[PDB]
Design a protein around this nucleic acid. Structure first.
Lengths: 214, 100, 135, 133, 64, 149
RNA sequence: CGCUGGGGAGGAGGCACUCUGGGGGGACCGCCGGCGAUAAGCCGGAGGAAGGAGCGGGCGACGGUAGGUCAGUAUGCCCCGAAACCCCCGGGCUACACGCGCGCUACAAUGGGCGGGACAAUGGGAUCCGACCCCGAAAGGGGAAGGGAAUCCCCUAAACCCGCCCUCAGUUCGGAUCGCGGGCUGCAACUCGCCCGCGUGAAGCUGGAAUCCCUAGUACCCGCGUGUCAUCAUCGCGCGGCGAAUACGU
């Protein structure tokens, strides 16, 4: 029962989806600015371009990246939340419209509850959910170790976005809760730094394990 | 009254041969001719398996027979008919004539 | 005016649900036949069950007793062309099982392929049993 | 006067006709303000919102599109409309703004489908049945 | 626990058993030891100019 | 002011609401218990689906006419669930379409061409155009961008 | 038709745009920098439709495997030659306590149902494709234009959008299995064929050890053509629709 003023929407200014602005959005993390693109656009849709060039993903809008991360099926070959999540025909794969709608409704709910800019909230969530330290196997002399290595911002972004989307999928699996409400809850919790956020929990866990085996 | 002539063939050189012959036939005299008009090329495709047995990975040969098609309209004058019908067609080309 | 448990012939159906779906608790009535019967009777198939009058229940029972006389074409009934009478009919909970049983029993009696397969408990129609149909 | 322009996408071909008028835009006889879904409506209307009312309120565009799915049709119409507006205005500021926003408005996309190959020909060129003995 | 930033100025070469780690040199900023150039291992695609946050400043990864 | 200037769903709604005065258009005997094609499993839930179907056929004849009864079957067909077998496409039934078109002709909204389907008359053209005019007069307040059309 | 602004369908007439198909140009690390050694070459910018053998295919060397095929045709040796030769009539390869491979459908809300609204390409077509009209609830039945295919037909594809019902439940999830009835092909449908309607309503609540395919219009998801064909596609070979995430390494 969507009203017509929202079914047939026509933007006037150049904003994200015609509703939300960016010129007031700030980024404090000095390591993530050059990779969080906030250029004014209406349609956050790039038709596969920028993927062949190594560093081309920095020219993609952050909202489009969130949409593409959300356009998933779940955890297929690994376990998340304690279960496999294989839908395989009930999945929104190769369907960007449904992801568009999910993100739209999520941003609406965020605006309603917080009464702030949902893009600002997403930026805060990313910054608070991005990890700084990881592990890896390094060999010297002929034996195997487990060392502590730093992380690049272009990878921190991927980690954060993936974790947010996975938390949403978990919270939506087999429950009266919807994918949009789950995404909104996850983003708000990650922005407010609450332990009930999958992304923040994973960040803390990774950093702890690295500080341990460093 | 006009006459239409359709040419089909696998060889393009014979097609060009006959078409330029009739083009000179129609330019010597002053007569209106349209074309030659190229029609879509038609392909007979046949995919089949190589091995005469069932063992081994499967591999496929794809054969094709191509047919090119030209159309011509000649305005159907007596002199044109006379000096057109007298052209030896290369055996690798089929030609069919008829008046509208 | 709400009956949490309504007593239609032989069966007790839920009230919180719509009538077209409550009537499916009976054996022999699907959603489609239920919609047919409710439309013939003149009842809203989206109404909550339990908002049913004795008059309504009686009309439903009569239609079930014999639907073809109240409309209900001969091609929308479970047992068209009865073996021993013709007389297109629609059987419900009690008589449906007896009909199945007597069909199978006459097959077994005349000793036909389908009856032998029924006895042995094996696929009857056309299936292959090498790789599947394993208990 | 009148101008005609074209645009192409994967198996989709659009042709647009522009002249002077009030600001009506029609794709396959129907207005653009009620095109569905939203994600194609915005795709088609981005160039007009870029140019502005002070240019679009003096022209009438009609587009005829054929082939290749609704998103592809929308993108082809977008390309054709941008090219037609640029050729009608003969202004360089608009062309520069378009090239900065997205160079594929005026330039086209050169991506088609790869033919399929014989292991699982139905699925794709690089896809094949598994081996899990 | 907020880290200490540091900018990348030179790339040494790949490392790790599978080739997924990169050794670089970075100069510290905003920290107790600013301007000091040190050597550190990094996971992920990098290039000259990037900024990496360090929770430490006294590890000085070992050369290849 | 024409059909092409408003959405199809709202128009079909407003035309089904209006086709009820016309007495030549009424559901047949076998309508209350029947499916719309083999590709379906359950009957229509609405008790006034006949008028919606008739209005849709009317608008389709307007748009694409001349058109006979085998392409409307394709338009009204769809995708069937075949159990454990994969899904396929199947066309719909023709009796609904024949009855609808005959009722419309009786009312004088369409006529048949000798060899190419059916077309609308001026009497029917006026019907659609006026209903669309009313609907657009109602809409152009919610979306003022429709006034210039 | 609404407000005289608009919007449609034909015919004349055009070929402008699209498309079709013949010929020809265009990209060559060619220009500017760093690396490599001053070379062979490598990494970046520019403009560009296209950049770094542009993208995707065909053609697969001397040899060798006693790898597979004498049940595709040809062929030595042995054998049957009243037969193991070849033609009819009925059965079987479809038999089922079980072990395994490759798949389809599912375990639901990133959904099921009802009603409306959209949008392709490849290919094929003579007792063949069959529009159009009339019968029938459906499967289907009766006439019949045109087409030997840039002219007619197969052909208004599905996923997708809108509104209403359902709200976390062995359920309006799921369809196995079975009863009754109606049909088409064929000389012949029991063994042993496909379709339609009303009923019936089995396991299945995301799956251990282990293992597989994929770097761009690619993978996942969605449906159509053709080969086999009198009738029969969960198959092979192909066509399009929507459309990513990561790494430019060892």
């Amino acid at each position: 029962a969507k009203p017509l003023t929202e079914r047939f929407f026509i933007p006037k200014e150049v904003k994200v989806m015609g509703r939300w602005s960016v010129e007031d959005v700030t980024v404090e993390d000095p390591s993530l600015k050059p990779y969080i693109n906030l250029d004014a656009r209406i349609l956050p849709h790039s038709h596969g371009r920028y993927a062949k060039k190594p560093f081309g993903k920095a020219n993609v809008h952050i909202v489009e990246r969130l949409i593409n991360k959300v356009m998933r099926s779940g955890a297929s070959h690994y376990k998340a939340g304690g279960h496999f999540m294989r839908r395989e025909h009930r999945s929104i794969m190769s369907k960007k419209m449904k992801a568009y709608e999910v993100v739209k409704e999520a941003f609406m709910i965020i605006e309603r509850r917080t009464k702030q800019n949902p893009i600002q909230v997403l930026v805060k969530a990313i910054e608070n959910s991005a990890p700084r330290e990881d592990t890896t196997t390094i060999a010297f002399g002929g034996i195997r170790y487990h060392m502590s290595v730093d992380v690049s911002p272009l990878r921190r972004l991927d980690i954060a976005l993936k974790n947010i989307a996975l938390g949403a999928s978990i919270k939506c699996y087999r429950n009266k809760t919807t994918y949009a409400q789950a995404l909104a809850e996850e983003i708000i919790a990650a922005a407010n730094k609450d332990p009930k956020s999958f992304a923040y929990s994973k960040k803390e866990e990774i950093e702890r394990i690295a500080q341990s085996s460093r | 009254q006009k006459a239409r002539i359709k040419l089909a063939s696998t060889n393009i050189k014979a097609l060009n041969e006959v078409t330029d012959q009739i083009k000179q036939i129609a330019e010597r005299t002053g007569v209106r001719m349209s074309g030659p008009i190229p029609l879509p090329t038609k392909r007979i495709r046949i995919t089949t398996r190589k091995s005469p047995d069932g063992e081994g990975s499967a591999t496929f040969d794809r054969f094709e027979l191509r047919v090119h098609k030209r159309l011509v309209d000649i305005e159907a004058d007596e002199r044109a008919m006379r000096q057109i019908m007298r052209i030896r067609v290369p055996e690798d080309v089929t030609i069919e004539i008829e008046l509208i | 005016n709400f009956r949490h448990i309504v007593r239609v012939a032989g069966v007790d159906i839920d009230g919180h649900k719509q009538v077209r779906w409550a009537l499916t608790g009976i054996k022999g009535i699907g959603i489609n036949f239920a919609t047919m019967v409710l439309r013939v009777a003149g009842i809203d198939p989206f109404m909550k069950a339990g908002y049913l009058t004795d008059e309504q229940v009686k009309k439903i029972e009569e239609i079930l007793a014999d639907p073809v006389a109240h409309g209900i074409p001969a091609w929308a009934v479970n047992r068209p062309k009865d073996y021993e009478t013709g007389k297109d009919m629609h059987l419900i909970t009690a008589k449906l099982v007896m009909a199945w049983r007597e069909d199978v029993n006459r097959l077994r009696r005349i000793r036909a392929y389908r009856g032998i397969r029924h006895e042995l408990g094996l696929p009857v129609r056309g299936q292959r049993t090498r790789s599947n149909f394993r208990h | 006067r009148v101008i005609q322009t074209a645009g192409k996408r994967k198996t989709a071909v659009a042709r647009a006709t522009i002249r002077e008028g009030k600001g009506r835009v029609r794709i396959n006889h129907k207005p653009v303000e009620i095109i569905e879904p939203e994600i194609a409506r915005f795709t088609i209307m981005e160039p007009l919102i870029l140019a502005g009312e002070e240019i679009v309120s003096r022209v009438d565009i009609d587009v005829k599109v054929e082939g290749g799915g609704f998103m592809g049709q929308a993108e082809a119409a977008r390309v054709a409309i941008a090219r037609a507006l640029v050729e009608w205005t003969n202004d360089m500021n608009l062309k520069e703004k378009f090239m900065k926003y997205d160079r594929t408005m005026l330039v086209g996309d050169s991506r088609r489908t790869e033919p399929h190959k014989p292991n699982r020909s139905t699925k794709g060129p690089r896809a094949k049945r598994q081996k899990s003995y | 626990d907020e880290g200490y930033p540091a900018e990348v100025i030179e790339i040494v070469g790949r490392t790790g058993v599978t080739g997924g780690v990169t050794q670089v040199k970075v100069r510290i900023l905003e920290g107790r030891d600013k301007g000091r150039v040190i050597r550190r291992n990094v996971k992920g695609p990098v290039r000259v100019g990037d900024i990496v946050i360090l929770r430490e400043t006294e590890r000085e990864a070992r050369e290849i | 002011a024409t059909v092409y200037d408003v959405p199809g769903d709202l128009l079909v709604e407003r035309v089904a609401k209006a086709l009820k005065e016309v007495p030549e258009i009424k559901p047949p005997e076998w309508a209350p218990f029947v499916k719309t094609g083999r590709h379906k499993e359950r009957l229509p839930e609405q008790e006034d689906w006949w008028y919606y179907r008739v209005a849709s056929v009317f608008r389709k004849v307007y748009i694409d006419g001349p058109v006979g009864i085998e392409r409307l079957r394709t338009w009204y067909g769809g995708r069937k669930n075949r159990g454990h077998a994969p899904e396929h496409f199947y066309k719909a039934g023709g009796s609904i379409i024949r009855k609808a078109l005959q009722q419309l002709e009786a009312a004088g909204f369409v006529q048949k061409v000798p060899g190419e389907g059916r077309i609308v008359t001026p009497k029917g053209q006026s019907f659609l155009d006026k209903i669309a005019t009313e609907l657009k007069k109602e809409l152009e307040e919610q979306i003022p961008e429709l006034k210039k059309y």
